[PDB]
Enzyme design. Structure first.
Site, PDB file in Angstrom:
ATOM      1  N   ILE A  14      45.289  44.054  43.836  1.00 37.31           N
ATOM      2  CA  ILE A  14      44.998  42.655  43.569  1.00 37.31           C
ATOM      3  C   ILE A  14      45.439  42.288  42.151  1.00 37.31           C
ATOM      4  O   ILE A  14      45.504  43.111  41.223  1.00 37.31           O
ATOM      5  CB  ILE A  14      43.516  42.312  43.810  1.00 37.31           C
ATOM      6  CG1 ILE A  14      42.575  43.217  42.999  1.00 37.31           C
ATOM      7  CG2 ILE A  14      43.185  42.350  45.287  1.00 37.31           C
ATOM      8  CD1 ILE A  14      41.158  42.779  43.056  1.00 37.31           C
ATOM      9  N   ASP A  23      32.736  49.379  46.990  1.00 42.14           N
ATOM     10  CA  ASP A  23      33.626  50.537  47.104  1.00 42.14           C
ATOM     11  C   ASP A  23      33.623  51.320  45.796  1.00 42.14           C
ATOM     12  O   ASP A  23      33.561  50.709  44.738  1.00 42.14           O
ATOM     13  CB  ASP A  23      35.067  50.136  47.420  1.00 42.14           C
ATOM     14  CG  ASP A  23      35.866  51.243  48.078  1.00 42.14           C
ATOM     15  OD1 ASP A  23      35.537  51.573  49.242  1.00 42.14           O
ATOM     16  OD2 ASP A  23      36.901  51.674  47.506  1.00 42.14           O
ATOM     17  N   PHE A  44      34.409  45.218  38.502  1.00 43.85           N
ATOM     18  CA  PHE A  44      34.754  46.628  38.554  1.00 43.85           C
ATOM     19  C   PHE A  44      34.448  47.313  37.229  1.00 43.85           C
ATOM     20  O   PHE A  44      34.861  46.835  36.163  1.00 43.85           O
ATOM     21  CB  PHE A  44      36.248  46.784  38.810  1.00 43.85           C
ATOM     22  CG  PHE A  44      36.680  46.396  40.195  1.00 43.85           C
ATOM     23  CD1 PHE A  44      37.100  45.114  40.474  1.00 43.85           C
ATOM     24  CD2 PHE A  44      36.780  47.355  41.180  1.00 43.85           C
ATOM     25  CE1 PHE A  44      37.513  44.770  41.756  1.00 43.85           C
ATOM     26  CE2 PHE A  44      37.177  47.013  42.465  1.00 43.85           C
ATOM     27  CZ  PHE A  44      37.592  45.717  42.739  1.00 43.85           C
ATOM     28  N   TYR A  91      40.594  38.548  46.561  1.00 45.02           N
ATOM     29  CA  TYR A  91      40.839  38.406  48.000  1.00 45.02           C
ATOM     30  C   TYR A  91      40.621  36.973  48.511  1.00 45.02           C
ATOM     31  O   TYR A  91      40.688  36.760  49.729  1.00 45.02           O
ATOM     32  CB  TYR A  91      40.007  39.449  48.760  1.00 45.02           C
ATOM     33  CG  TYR A  91      40.439  40.866  48.461  1.00 45.02           C
ATOM     34  CD1 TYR A  91      41.566  41.415  49.046  1.00 45.02           C
ATOM     35  CD2 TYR A  91      39.782  41.631  47.508  1.00 45.02           C
ATOM     36  CE1 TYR A  91      41.953  42.720  48.820  1.00 45.02           C
ATOM     37  CE2 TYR A  91      40.183  42.933  47.228  1.00 45.02           C
ATOM     38  CZ  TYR A  91      41.275  43.476  47.887  1.00 45.02           C
ATOM     39  OH  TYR A  91      41.720  44.751  47.675  1.00 45.02           O
ATOM     40  N   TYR A  94      36.860  54.170  39.684  1.00 49.91           N
ATOM     41  CA  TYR A  94      36.244  52.850  39.643  1.00 49.91           C
ATOM     42  C   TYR A  94      35.037  52.760  40.571  1.00 49.91           C
ATOM     43  O   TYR A  94      34.918  53.503  41.566  1.00 49.91           O
ATOM     44  CB  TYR A  94      37.232  51.753  40.048  1.00 49.91           C
ATOM     45  CG  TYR A  94      37.576  51.729  41.515  1.00 49.91           C
ATOM     46  CD1 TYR A  94      36.794  51.077  42.451  1.00 49.91           C
ATOM     47  CD2 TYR A  94      38.650  52.488  41.980  1.00 49.91           C
ATOM     48  CE1 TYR A  94      37.092  51.120  43.798  1.00 49.91           C
ATOM     49  CE2 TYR A  94      38.950  52.545  43.325  1.00 49.91           C
ATOM     50  CZ  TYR A  94      38.202  51.835  44.240  1.00 49.91           C
ATOM     51  OH  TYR A  94      38.498  51.945  45.578  1.00 49.91           O
TER      52      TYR A  94
HETATM   53  C1  LIG Z   1      41.383  51.349  48.311  1.00 51.23           C
HETATM   54  C2  LIG Z   1      41.833  51.097  47.014  1.00 51.23           C
HETATM   55  C3  LIG Z   1      42.099  49.689  46.411  1.00 51.23           C
HETATM   56  C4  LIG Z   1      42.451  48.678  47.496  1.00 51.23           C
HETATM   57  N1  LIG Z   1      43.177  47.553  46.897  1.00 51.23           N
HETATM   58  C5  LIG Z   1      44.510  47.226  47.571  1.00 51.23           C
HETATM   59  C6  LIG Z   1      44.293  46.977  48.980  1.00 51.23           C
HETATM   60  C7  LIG Z   1      44.976  47.719  49.953  1.00 51.23           C
HETATM   61  C8  LIG Z   1      44.788  47.404  51.297  1.00 51.23           C
HETATM   62  C9  LIG Z   1      43.866  46.408  51.640  1.00 51.23           C
HETATM   63  C10 LIG Z   1      43.179  45.690  50.658  1.00 51.23           C
HETATM   64  N2  LIG Z   1      43.467  45.990  49.335  1.00 51.23           N
HETATM   65  C11 LIG Z   1      42.796  46.893  45.779  1.00 51.23           C
HETATM   66  O1  LIG Z   1      43.615  46.049  45.351  1.00 51.23           O
HETATM   67  C12 LIG Z   1      41.527  47.026  45.114  1.00 51.23           C
HETATM   68  C13 LIG Z   1      41.685  47.289  43.625  1.00 51.23           C
HETATM   69  C14 LIG Z   1      42.071  48.797  43.447  1.00 51.23           C
HETATM   70  C15 LIG Z   1      41.073  49.751  44.079  1.00 51.23           C
HETATM   71  C16 LIG Z   1      40.850  49.323  45.576  1.00 51.23           C
HETATM   72  N3  LIG Z   1      40.597  47.912  45.819  1.00 51.23           N
HETATM   73  S1  LIG Z   1      39.086  47.487  46.178  1.00 51.23           S
HETATM   74  N4  LIG Z   1      38.033  48.401  45.751  1.00 51.23           N
HETATM   75  O2  LIG Z   1      38.880  46.063  45.886  1.00 51.23           O
HETATM   76  C17 LIG Z   1      39.058  47.562  47.908  1.00 51.23           C
HETATM   77  C18 LIG Z   1      39.284  46.440  48.666  1.00 51.23           C
HETATM   78  C19 LIG Z   1      39.388  46.561  50.064  1.00 51.23           C
HETATM   79 CL1  LIG Z   1      39.654  45.141  51.033  1.00 51.23          CL
HETATM   80  C20 LIG Z   1      39.254  47.781  50.737  1.00 51.23           C
HETATM   81  C21 LIG Z   1      39.023  48.881  49.946  1.00 51.23           C
HETATM   82 CL2  LIG Z   1      38.886  50.432  50.735  1.00 51.23          CL
HETATM   83  C22 LIG Z   1      38.957  48.802  48.547  1.00 51.23           C
END
Ligand SMILES: C=C[C@H]1CN(Cc2ccccn2)C(=O)[C@@H]2CCC[C@H]1N2[S@@](=N)(=O)c1cc(Cl)cc(Cl)c1
EC number: 5.2.1.8
Length: 107
Positions: free
Chosen positions: A56, A37, A99, A82, A26
């Site tokens: 999320i 990210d 995304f 978030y 992604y």
């Molecule tokens: C690092 C991978 C995940 C992180 N998360 C879950 C998550 C785990 C810990 C803190 C915040 N969110 C997620 O739910 C989403 C959706 C899947 C891909 C990434 N994110 S993300 N790109 O929005 C992301 C969000 C955040 Cl706050 C940090 C990072 Cl490193 C990545």
């Protein structure tokens, strides 16, 4: 909520189920177009298991409607991401997230 717009089709038949590991690449961007990210930048597919509260809400609901091989754009409202706080330093407050998700494998 989460909107799913297909970029390129999957197999049309194999959708993620609770207990399966979903493997994706992604890129996440703000509405401004700025990247926040990407798994591609890390040279490492991102993996999560459906139904374990690991991501999320917009991901849980959006990726579940993708079939293996599919690439889609997920547009996710703040309340499905978030929310008001965001994640300071990474995700701004009250952010709509967009995304590009490619469902590589289910294992
Ligand atoms: C690092 C991978 C995940 C992180 N998360 C879950 C998550 C785990 C810990 C803190 C915040 N969110 C997620 O739910 C989403 C959706 C899947 C891909 C990434 N994110 S993300 N790109 O929005 C992301 C969000 C955040 Cl706050 C940090 C990072 Cl490193 C990545």
């Amino acid at each position: 909520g989460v909107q799913v717009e297909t970029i390129s089709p999957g197999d049309g038949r194999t959708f993620p189920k609770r207990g399966q590991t979903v493997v994706v690449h992604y890129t996440g961007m703000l509405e401004d177009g700025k990247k926040f990210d990407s798994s591609r930048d890390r040279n490492k597919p991102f993996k999560f298991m459906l139904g374990k509260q690991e991501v999320i809400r917009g991901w849980e609901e959006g990726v579940a409607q993708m079939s293996v091989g599919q690439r889609a754009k997920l547009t996710i409202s703040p309340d499905y991401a978030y929310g008001a706080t965001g994640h300071p330093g990474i995700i701004p407050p009250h952010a709509t997230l967009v995304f590009d998700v490619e469902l590589l494998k289910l294992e």
